[PDB]
Chains A and B, each alone.
Chain A
């Protein structure tokens, strides 16, 4: 009508920063021939506006001059995705015919007025992604025809009103990302049509109501990231349409209810980051639809039940960071669909089961800091789908070349501190995308296959603390992405290869505790990321090369326990990030360079058991050093009023 149109024009005249590319260019002639056919966002019935849809039209303004008293037939209103600021007026509740009301994705502030409950015909209420605050008014519970309420991503506080139990047609309730508090009202459980209930990311406290067992139609129950407490009520097992139950990151205590096995539709169960205790009920094995079972970061004890072999759709099993113990039953890995088996940080014992990877799809197997033992099952040897294998801290055994097969998609493998023996196979080269190969402190013997150096994606290679022999070849330069190279604690012999000079991504290099002979390569001067270099406990000889003083990022340099001789270069002053320097147990002669006074970052220094003489340089590390940092030298002398076990200088 002319009156409706002119009122909307007056509201439009108040908008700011409007750019005349606006769709509202079409709002000009208030007569019905224009208003009801050509005004953008306006639809009419019998010459009167019933729908106003200005979603995402770049409007900046407020509802201060919205024509509440001039649009009596407003039935659908969508003002979402604009720059409307200010508050929500009580006057919105005078639109008696309103069925659809969306003010989402704006910059609205203030409280939701109770008058919105006067909208007795409302089907959908959407106010998401604003900065609305205060409590949800109890009068919202008068919306007896509403099927969807979404007020997520606001600043709401206070409790969910118990009047929400009167919303008998409610299907979807989305209140996540607020600061709602108090207990969930038990009246929520008596909503017969409810399908989705998302209350996650709030500050709700108290126990989950046992009335939730009356929610026979709910398929989605998200209440993660709250402060819910008490035990999960056994009545939750009567939510027999649930597809996804997420209660993670709460303060729930007590045992997992055995009645969860009653939910035959349940595909996703997230209970992690709670304080759930007791044993895993064997009835959880009866959740026939379960795909994604996550009960990590709890306090569960006892064994994994054999009934997990009935979970034939299982894909993800997260059990890490619990106190589970005992042998694992073959059923735990029996799903042919299993891709992720996460058991780290428990106290499991015994062998891995021969069911593992029987379906050919297992990707990530993580077992760190359990007590597993025994040989690797041949089905894991043959598991070509593996991506991430973490065995650190267990006691698996056997010949490493027989234990493991070929893994084309392997990304990461850590076998640290296990009990494998034998020689490394060239088969590892087939993991062309492997970025970490960690085999520390096994009983590996024999040579490093030359094919290892063609694993050009490697970033971390740790073969430390084995009994590996042989010489490192110049083709070590081929691993050019290597950042952490740990070959320490082996029996490697021959000279350190000059090819290390080309490993310009190196940050951490440990070749110590080997049988390396001959000189430190003089070309190790261009490793601009190298902060750690340990060549200690070898048979390295001749002089310390000046190129090392160009490794500007070095923080620790340990060359101790070698046969190095000659003088300490005064160019050490250039290592301005050097914090720890160990040259002890060598054959170094002459004076400690006075240029050490330049090394203000140095905190730890040891030059003991050399053939050095003369005064001690003036820097904090030398002043703070204990007498054994200097003992065993030829003619060192100190200064009075600083005891370090030296005869004073003349």
Chain B
């Protein structure tokens, strides 16, 4: 089970 990470908006 694997997802890339997600950068959140400021």
| A residues neighboring B (CB under 8 Å) | 80-81, 102, 104-105, 126, 128-129, 148, 150, 152, 172, 174, 176-177, 196, 198, 200-201, 220, 222, 224, 244, 246, 248, 268, 270, 272-273, 292, 294, 296-297, 316, 318
Task: Please classify the interface of chain B as helix (H, G, I), strand (E, B), loop, or mixed, using the class held by over half of its residues.
Answer: loop
Contact check, A316 vs B9: say whether CB atoms are below 8 A apart. Answer: yes
Contact: B2 with A174, CB < 8 Å?
Answer: yes
Q: Do the beta carbons of B5 and A201 come within 8 Å of each other?
A: yes
A-chain residues with CB within 8 Å of residue B1 when the two chains form the complex: 80-81, 102, 104-105, 126, 128-129
A198, B2: Cβ atoms under 8 Å? Answer: no
Measured CB to CB, the nearest residue on chain B to A152 is B5
A residues in contact with B10, CB < 8 Å: 248, 270, 272-273, 294, 296-297, 318
Q: Is the CB of B9 within 8 A of A128?
A: no
- Asked if residues B9 and A198 are in contact (CB atoms below 8 Å), the reply is no
Decide: B5 and A174 in contact? CB cutoff 8 A.
Answer: yes
Q: How far is the CB of B7 from chain A (nearest CB, A)?
A: 3
Residue numbers in A under 8 Å from B9 (CB-CB)? 270, 292, 294, 316, 318
Do the beta carbons of B5 and A200 come within 8 Å of each other? yes
Could you give 18 example pairs across A and B, Cβ below 8 Å?
A: A81-B1, A126-B2, A128-B2, A172-B2, A172-B4, A174-B2, A174-B4, A200-B5, A200-B7, A220-B4, A224-B7, A268-B7, A270-B9, A273-B10, A296-B10, A316-B9, A318-B9, A318-B10
- Chain B residue contacts of A222, Cβ below 8 A: 4-7
Q: Please name the residue on chain B nearest to A342 by beta carbon.
A: B10
User: CA separation between A176 and B7, bound complex, in Å?
Assistant: 11
**Chain A CB within 10 Å — which of B1, B3, B7, B9 has the most?**
B7
Assembly CA distance A105 to B2 (angstroms): 10
- B contact residues around A297 at 8 Å (CB): 10
When distances are taken between beta carbons in the complex, the residues of chain B under 8 Å from A172 are 2, 4
CA distance A220 to B1 in the complex (A): 19
What's the least CB distance linking A187 to chain B, in Å?
Answer: 21
Instruction: Give Cα A294–Cα B10 distance, bound, in whole angstroms.
Output: 7
CB proximity of A585 to chain B, nearest CB, Å = 49
Q: Which A residues are in CB contact (< 8 Å) with B7?
A: 200, 222, 224, 244, 246, 248, 268, 270
Query: Which residues on the A side are within 8 Å of B3 (C-beta)?
Result: 174
Q: Which of B1, B6, B10 has the most CB of A within 10 A?
A: B10
List the A side residues contacting B2 at CB < 8 Å. 104, 126, 128, 148, 150, 152, 172, 174
Contacts of A294 in B (CB 8 A): 9-10
Bound CA–CA A273/B1 (angstroms): 31
Q: How far is the CB of B9 from chain A (nearest CB, A)?
A: 6
Cα(A297)–Cα(B9), bound, Å: 13
Residues in B neighbouring A80, C-beta threshold 8 A? 1
CB nearest to A199 among chain B residues? B5
CA A616 – CA B9 in complex, angstroms? 59
> Whose C-beta in chain B lies nearest to the C-beta of A172?
B4
Residues of chain A with a CB closer than 8 A to B4's CB = 172, 174, 196, 198, 220, 222
Bound complex: CA of A176 vs CA of B5, how far in Å? 7
A-B contact sample (6 more), CB < 8 A, given A128-B2, A148-B2, A270-B10: A222-B4, A222-B5, A248-B7, A248-B10, A294-B10, A318-B10
Distance of A270 Cα from B3 Cα, bound (Å): 19
- The docked-state distance in angstroms from the alpha carbon of A292 to that of B6 is 14
- Name the B residues within 8 Å of A296 (CB-CB): 10
Q: Specify the chain B residue showing the minimal Cβ separation from A102.
A: B1
The distance in angstroms between the C-alpha atoms of A126 and B9, with both chains bound, is: 28
**A105: nearest chain-B partner, CB-CB:** B1
Kindly report which residue of chain A lies nearest to residue B3, judged by CB atoms.
A174
The 10 residue pairs across chains A and B that have the minimum distance between CB atoms: A246-B7, A150-B2, A198-B5, A176-B5, A272-B10, A222-B5, A294-B10, A270-B7, A318-B10, A196-B4
